[PDB]
Design a protein around this nucleic acid. Structure first.
Lengths: 82, 142, 129, 141, 104
RNA sequence: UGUUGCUGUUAAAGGGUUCGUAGUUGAAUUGAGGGCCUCUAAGGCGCAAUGGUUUAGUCCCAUCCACUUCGGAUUGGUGACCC
RNA sequence: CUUUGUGGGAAAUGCCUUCCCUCAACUCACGGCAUCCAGGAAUGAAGGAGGGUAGUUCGGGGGAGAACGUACUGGUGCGUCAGAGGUGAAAUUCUUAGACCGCACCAAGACGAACUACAGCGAAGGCAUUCUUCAAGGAUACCUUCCUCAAUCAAGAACCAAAGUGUGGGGAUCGAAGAUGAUUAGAGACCAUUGUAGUCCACACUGCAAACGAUGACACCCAUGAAUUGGGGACUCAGCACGUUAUCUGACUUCUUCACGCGAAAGCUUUGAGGUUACAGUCUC
């Protein structure tokens, strides 16, 4: 049977982070590789500004507000939230 | 609505003090213009000297003639009308006789079929007029 | 905003009870809201309740057995006394038999019944049937 | 509710539910501190220091990887601004409106906005002279 | 007084505009708000069927040759206007609430 | 005249709107402790033991094979679980 | 002057050791000793307020400058010739000094149809051609920043439809007043032909509307279905734009199958007039 105290998985996929039981973060990090060398650099999913390394004028991320649009040809590894 | 705060008191008080002036049942007590207006001075009765007998009509749904008396007031030198409130006792009132005067019923509205008159004549020459009507006493001309 | 924590809680409970719902969510938590619930759970009007931790402010969750009929809040927290237990108990409640007014005291948080017993009045808090 | 004028929004930033530092951050307190102060010398406000840090270095929060947050750092090293962030910004916007209105006295909108921004600045002022962070003789103009 | 119509005879919802531009009538020249005003779309023929035959005879490059054009117009009417030419009529309660949207 | 205990869509009555001082009202945290003995005091979604042929069960197995909606078979089986 | 990625390999009784031997132009390991020198002990970060950054985000939001569109009215030129305006019917009115009508061109002023919606933006009043330009506002996204800075309001301040008033510019259209013709028993009437103020703009006043949703503001809880409007989630203004499925936050509203409930009824329904005699969230008029 359903419970408010312990909610169902399918229900809490949907919900906003301000509407959630815990109200946790809705973001994560990523390792973006600089293809202009090999330099592994941490980058943030909702970067909301450019990030550069000295191994790239290829950049890493675009500033765009919806979530970062990472430069093509770049290695993406997905770090966990926790 | 209203305020439920602990220190809200003064707003409540001042609200009441404003809104009682929208009541006419507050004014009628506290204000002395009402007292002044009343021809007895707000006293129970007053006496007056009969001036003239005045025949007074009646309103449209009940056609009748009513017997009334134009009286002057000793106290304030005001004039007033009053009704003779017995059958065939216009006789027992004569000009320049002292007479008492009372209110009748509702005293902010005029009585039906006599406009402007809230005043009935109880006593003529301190004799009970009822006593003359339903014979016990006889009128003095003494 | 909300100017009484209790009012925010116990208008969720009352509404939910009138719809017969068997659990309710409560948006904030306070030390006070806990104690109120505790009372009613002893006397048999609530199954259980959980307090959950978001590490900002908690979210209480309660299991209604449907045995309540109202849970009110007396908002100004007016002063009630040893004689004036009588007054309140008549005026805001449908009965003297099963009406429960809950009060604050220096001692803690308790029913009027227990308040009289220990002979301390105080400021009122809330009530339930 | 929005302080002045209409608005209800829920656009906000949450927190992590883990207040201890990530396993992929092996950086010490000191490195974080140094980075903050370094950036600050360019004239950057704390708001953009945090952004630079989180995006480049993967920092969860400054507060999570050091015992203190961004202003406390700056203060202790004597780099802190004497005009709080929120106040300064409003005053900039304000002055810029007053430029536009100097030229355009037919502009209805920006006039009303300036009235808002004024009284908002005053509220801030009043606050920070109760809770001392400005001199007690401070005034907008 | 009584709320006879929820939308008040308008396509304007509460708490949005509170002002929509006036528009003239093609009958009496009366002005009313655009939302109140009673729109219709005419599609008026340039020839009757009876005459269409006769003209299409004398035509070679037209009629048969190309389909005849029509005069199109939008007609925004006043309330009074509409009712009097009986293109809008009073309806019982159940029917008044019905709409057909902007389709014919 | 409605503090206890009033009303304001249409009946008497929400100010044309916004800013704003006196005034009124204002979120959460600091935390109200424990053990050993007796008591059939209760619950048990803990548990060693040992009980129960269907004196109670279901998965596996046996025999059929029934194209597909029969079954029974005994010690079945530290199995499952029940007093 | 190798190997050089990192765990892997070897070998012990998850760990140790050996071996590979720890990359971002300084990175990793070891040592001298030379320096400089208090500082990391703070409640938290409210589906409470303020601020930041980003999508050349979103919109009949606001100001400025420049063009564009036909029509109305007038003028001019080129042609035609007798009626034309206008109404229920007429008449006022305009015509051989050529009207009406057609085409061409120009002048002046206003306005921006259709598309334009049970749509959008703005605090409200209100806001619609295009291009350029100036300063803003809301929504959304964020593990950035601040830490109670709030809510509502006597006093006081700002904004405010149309008509009105002052001064200057403009004056095409419509048009109170006025004039004329009808209609009528009577008729500046309602109607018709005209026409001044006004209608437009700049700078001042006025603050008087059915300024209405006849519904004060902020906050909590509250169910049924299908859509729409923005944002977010799963070469050449271009790693783009639209649509479909599903989800979410923010706005406007419909069920003409809106749940409970309320109300005298009409009606109201997460969008309250509901959660109120079981009468108390807060403030004000």
């Amino acid at each position: 049977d359903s419970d408010l105290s312990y909610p169902t998985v399918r229900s809490e996929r949907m919900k906003h982070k301000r509407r959630r039981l815990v109200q946790g973060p809705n973001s994560y990090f990523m390792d973006v590789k600089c293809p202009g060398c090999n330099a592994i650099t941490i980058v943030y999913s909702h970067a909301t500004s450019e990030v550069q390394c000295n191994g790239c004028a290829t950049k890493l991320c675009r500033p765009t507000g919806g979530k970062a649009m990472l430069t093509t040809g770049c290695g993406f590894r997905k770090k966990a939230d926790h | 609505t209203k305020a439920n705060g602990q220190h809200a008191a003064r707003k409540l008080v001042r609200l009441r003090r404003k809104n009682r002036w929208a009541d006419k049942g507050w004014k009628k007590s506290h204000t002395f213009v009402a007292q002044k207006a009343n021809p007895f001075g707000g006293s129970s009765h007053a006496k007056g000297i009969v001036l003239e007998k005045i025949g007074v009509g009646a309103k449209q749904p009940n056609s009748a003639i009513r017997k009334c008396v134009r009286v002057q007031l000793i106290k304030n030198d005001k004039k007033i009308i009053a009704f003779v409130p017995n059958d065939g006792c216009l006789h027992f009132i004569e000009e320049n006789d002292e007479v008492l005067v009372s209110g009748f019923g509702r005293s902010g509205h005029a009585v039906g079929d006599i406009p402007g008159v809230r005043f009935k004549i109880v006593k003529v020459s301190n004799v009970g007029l009822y006593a003359l009507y339903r014979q016990k006493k006889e009128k003095p001309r003494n | 905003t909300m100017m009484s924590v209790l009012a925010n809680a116990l208008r969720c409970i009352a509404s939910a009870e009138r719809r017969g719902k068997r659990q309710v969510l409560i948006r904030p938590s306070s030390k006070v809201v806990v104690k109120f619930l505790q009372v009613m759970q002893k006397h048999g009007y609530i199954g259980e309740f959980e307090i959950i931790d978001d590490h900002r402010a908690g979210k209480i969750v309660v299991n209604l057995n449907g045995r309540l009929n109202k849970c009110g809040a007396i908002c100004p927290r007016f002063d009630c006394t040893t004689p004036d237990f009588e007054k309140w108990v008549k005026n805001i409640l449908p009965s003297r038999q099963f009406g429960f007014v809950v009060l604050t005291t220096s001692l803690g948080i308790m029913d009027h019944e227990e308040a009289r017993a220990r002979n301390t009045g105080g400021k009122v808090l809330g009530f339930f049937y | 509710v929005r302080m002045q004028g209409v608005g209800h929004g829920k656009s906000a930033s949450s927190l992590p539910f883990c207040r201890t530092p990530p396993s992929w951050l092996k950086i010490a307190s000191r490195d974080v501190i140094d980075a903050v102060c370094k950036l600050a010398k360019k004239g950057l406000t704390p708001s953009r220091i945090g952004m630079q840090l989180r995006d480049s270095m993967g920092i969860a929060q400054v507060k999570n990887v050091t015992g203190r947050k961004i202003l406390r750092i700056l203060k202790h090293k004597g780099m802190a601004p004497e005009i709080p962030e929120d106040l300064y910004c409003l005053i900039k916007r304000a002055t810029e409106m007053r430029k536009h209105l100097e030229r355009n006295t037919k502009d209805r909108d920006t006039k009303f906005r300036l009235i808002l921004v004024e009284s908002r600045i005053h509220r801030l002022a009043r606050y920070y002279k109760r809770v001392k962070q400005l001199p007690p003789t401070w005034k907008y103009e | 007084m009584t709320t006879k119509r929820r939308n008040h005879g308008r396509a304007k919802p509460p708490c949005s505009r509170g002002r929509t531009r006036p528009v003239h009538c093609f009958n009496c020249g009366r002005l009313a708000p655009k939302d109140k005003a009673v729109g219709r779309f005419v599609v008026r023929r340039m020839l009757d069927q009876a005459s269409a035959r006769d003209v299409a005879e004398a035509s070679n490059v037209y009629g048969a040759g190309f389909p005849m054009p029509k005069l199109y117009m939008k007609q925004r009417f006043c309330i009074a206007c509409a009712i009097h030419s009986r293109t809008v009529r009073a309806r019982p309660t159940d029917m008044r609430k019905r709409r057909f949207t902007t389709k014919v």
